[PDB]
Structures are given as structure tokens and as C-alpha cells.
Design a binder for this molecule. Structure first.
Ligand SMILES: CCCCCCCC/C=C\CCCCCCCC(=O)OC[C@H](O)CO
Ligand SMILES: CCCCCCCC/C=C\CCCCCCCC(=O)OC[C@H](O)CO
Ligand SMILES: CCCCCCCCCCCCCCC
Ligand SMILES: CCCCCCCCCCCCCCC
Ligand SMILES: CCCCCCCCCCCCCCC
Ligand SMILES: CCCCCCCCCCCCCCC
Ligand SMILES: CCCCCCCCCCCCCCC
Ligand code: NA
Ligand code: NA
Ligand SMILES: [Sr+2]
Length: 294
């Protein structure tokens, strides 16, 4: 069963590789079709699509009476797309944030702080409803300020490329995790806090691969949109749905970390830029986090 495990592992890795580029290319074409910025298509379509694992993981975990995992992989994903994902992408393709995007990032920061504040006691179902509504408003507000649309061929291929791309990365992530679980099982290596905090990683591979793909094609806005949007999607969506099934226990330490990194993200976007040395810091902080957090 290790033989299939190896097979699933790199094939999914191959799907993650090409599927992310196709998802990026498809989204970029769709953005130009509906006359919206790359940030917009990244913060909505791409963000939500890549956050489907978190949502279904949080929903499932909390439903199976494991709310700590539910909040733990919602919030863990946040720290991860700012620290690891954005960190790598910033180095690859430095971003100077325009003022229209700085405002969106400022709203993000307020959202995170607010979630952190009402989250001190934990996360009730009402807490979840609130976050989900703000999530909806954000998506609406982001689209309106990012769209300038005035206006069956060139769209169809664009849409197909986006859909196949998303299926590629979602399935690719599945096979990566599955293929990994099989090798660990067949080699009797299977721990399951490893087994968790790696499915708590495979949850975040779609965001990682997709952002790296956009970074290589110098689509900084799409990257930034993907990171910001995925965090609101995991908090206002994944975390939210989790609280609907069960009260999520407080994660003040990780929330404090998330707020700080979110704060740093805004400041860099407002007065400096998101380039190499800012990317350096994010990676550093992520290293310290995965070395000090549990
Ligand atoms: C940034 C704005 C933060 C606004 C934070 C508003 C917090 C309101 C509050 O503390 O509500 C109690 C909470 O519902 C108890 O579970
Ligand atoms: C490792 C050994 C057993 C657990 C394997 C768990 C493999 C989970 C793969 C991803 C998946 O299928 O979704 C996660 C869900 O928890 C699935 O019930
Ligand atoms: C250079 C080593 C091979 C690289 C390409 C590997 C492709 C592996 C595909 C595995 C498919 C397994 C299907 C199992 C049902
Ligand atoms: C390699 C994937 C497994 C280890 C964790 C992620 C390391 C950085 C991967 C960047 C792509
Ligand atoms: C090593 C990390 C150095 C991070 C420097 C951040 C600030 C750069 C000027 C703004
Ligand atoms: C040119 C690309 C340079 C990339 C440098 C990355 C430096 C930081 C790596 C992580 C360090 C953690 C401490
Ligand atoms: C890298 C080491 C980080 C140690 C804790 C304080 C970080 C402050 C980051 C913003 C300046
Ligand atoms: Na996402
Ligand atoms: Na995800
Ligand atoms: Sr609460």
C-alpha cells in the first residue's frame, strides 16, 4: 500500500503544479472579462476556492466534536498564508500596494482584530453568524470598489481553465495528503498530531501553490488578494461554520500572532512595500511560530 502511496503523492504534486498555473491563468482572464482588478478576483473566486478545504475541515471537525481542530486549522491557515505563503511570494515578486488596495487591507486588519476580540471567550454560534455576515459584506464591498464593468467564446475557455485549474489543485492537494498518509502508514511512521498538523498543512497547499504561480507571473495583486481573502474566508467562513456546530475554544495566542502579522502586513502596505526584506520577516516569523506554537 506504500506503492500507491508514492503514486498518489507526486501525481497530486503534479496536479498541484500545473493546476495552480491554470487556476491563475483562468482567474486572470476572468478578471479582465468582468473588468475587475486581479486583487478582486484573487480575494473572491480564488480565495474562496482555495479555502474550501478549511471550510469542509472546520465543519467536519466541529461536527465530530473536535472544535479545537476546527479553530486550530482556521487560524493556523491565516498565520500560514501571511507568514509562509505571502512571505515566499513577496520575495519572488515584490509588491507596491496602491491606495485602493491599502484600504482593503485596513478593513482586513479591523476584521481580524474584531474576530480576536469577540474570540477571547471563544467562538459561539452568534460569533459565527456575525463573522459570516461581515464576510459577505467584505466580498460585496471588495467587488464594487474593484469592478468597473461597462459591458459565447473567449469567456468559455477562460472559465474552463479556471474550473479545471481549481479541480486540479483541490484534487492535487487531496492526493498529496492521501499519498503521504499511506507512506506513513505502510512504514508504520503514522503519528497523528503529525497526521493532523499535516492535514492542517495540506489544507493550505492550494493557497501556497496558487500564490507561487501568480508570483512567478508577477501578479502581485492577485497574490495579495488571495492571501487577504483566504484569511477572511477561513475566519468568516471556516471558523464561522465550525462555531455553528459547536462552541470553538479560545485561541488567544494564535490570534495575537495573527493580529500582529496582519498589523505588520498593513503597515508595510501603507508606508513601505511588500518586497524581499518584508517577505524575509514574514518567513522568519513563520519559522518562529511553527517552532514555538502548538
Ligand atoms: C476593531 C473593532 C473591535 C470591536 C470589538 C467589539 C467587541 C464587542 C464585545 O466585546 O462583544 C462581547 C462579545 O460578544 C462577548 O462574547
Ligand atoms: C493516516 C491514517 C488514517 C487517517 C487518514 C486520514 C486521511 C484524510 C485525507 C483527506 C480527506 O479525505 O479528508 C479528510 C477527512 O478527515 C477524511 O474523513
Ligand atoms: C521521474 C519519476 C516519475 C515522475 C512522474 C511520476 C508520475 C506518477 C503517476 C502515478 C499515478 C498513480 C496512479 C495510482 C492509481
Ligand atoms: C515541501 C512541502 C512539504 C514541507 C512544508 C512546506 C515547505 C515549503 C514548500 C514551498 C512550496
Ligand atoms: C531580516 C528582516 C529585515 C526586515 C526589514 C523590514 C523593514 C524594511 C524597511 C521597511
Ligand atoms: C533572492 C532571494 C533571497 C531569499 C532570501 C530568504 C531569506 C530568509 C529565509 C528564511 C529565514 C528564516 C530565519
Ligand atoms: C524575527 C524575530 C522576531 C522577534 C519578536 C518581535 C518581532 C517584531 C516584528 C516587527 C518588528
Ligand atoms: Na483560500
Ligand atoms: Na486552503
Ligand atoms: Sr465569544
Amino acid at each position: 500500500m506504500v506503492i500507491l502511496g508514492v503514486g498518489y503523492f507526486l501525481l497530486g504534486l503534479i496536479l498541484l503544479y500545473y493546476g495552480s498555473d491554470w487556476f491563475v491563468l483562468g482567474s486572470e482572464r476572468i478578471a479582465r472579462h468582468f473588468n475587475v482588478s486581479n486583487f478582486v478576483i484573487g480575494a473572491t473566486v480564488m480565495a474562496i476556492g482555495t479555502s474550501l478545504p478549511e471550510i469542509l475541515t472546520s465543519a467536519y471537525a466541529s461536527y465530530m466534536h473536535a472544535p479545537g481542530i476546527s479553530i486550530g486549522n482556521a487560524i493556523g491557515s491565516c498565520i500560514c498564508n501571511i507568514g509562509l505563503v505571502l512571505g515566499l511570494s513577496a520575495i519572488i515578486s515584490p509588491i507596491i500596494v496602491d491606495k485602493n488596495l491599502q484600504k482593503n487591507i485596513l478593513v482586513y486588519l479591523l476584521f481580524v482584530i474584531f474576530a480576536a476580540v469577540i474570540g477571547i471567550d471563544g467562538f459561539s454560534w452568534i460569533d459565527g453568524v456575525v463573522l459570516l455576515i461581515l464576510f459577505i459584506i467584505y466580498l460585496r464591498w471588495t467587488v464594487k470598489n474593484g469592478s468597473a464593468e461597462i459591458e459565447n467564446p473567449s469567456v468559455v475557455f477562460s472559465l474552463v481553465l479556471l474550473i479545471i485549474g481549481l479541480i486540479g489543485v483541490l484534487v492535487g492537494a487531496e492526493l498529496f495528503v492521501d499519498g503521504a498518509k499511506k507512506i506513513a502508514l505502510a512504514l508504520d511512521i503514522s503519528d497523528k498530531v503529525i497526521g493532523f498538523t499535516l492535514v492542517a498543512f495540506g489544507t493550505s497547499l492550494p493557497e501556497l501553490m496558487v500564490s507561487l504561480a501568480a508570483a512567478k507571473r508577477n501578479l502581485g495583486g492577485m497574490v495579495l488578494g488571495n492571501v487577504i481573502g483566504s484569511n477572511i474566508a477561513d475566519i468568516g467562513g471556516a471558523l464561522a461554520v465550525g462555531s455553528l456546530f459547536m462552541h470553538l475554544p479560545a485561541e488567544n495566542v494564535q490570534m495575537a500572532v495573527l493580529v500582529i502579522m496582519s498589523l505588520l502586513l498593513y503597515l508595510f502596505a501603507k508606508y513601505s512595500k511588500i518586497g524581499r526584506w518584508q517577505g524575509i520577516l514574514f518567513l522568519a516569523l513563520y519559522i518562529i511560530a511553527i517552532a514555538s506554537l502548538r
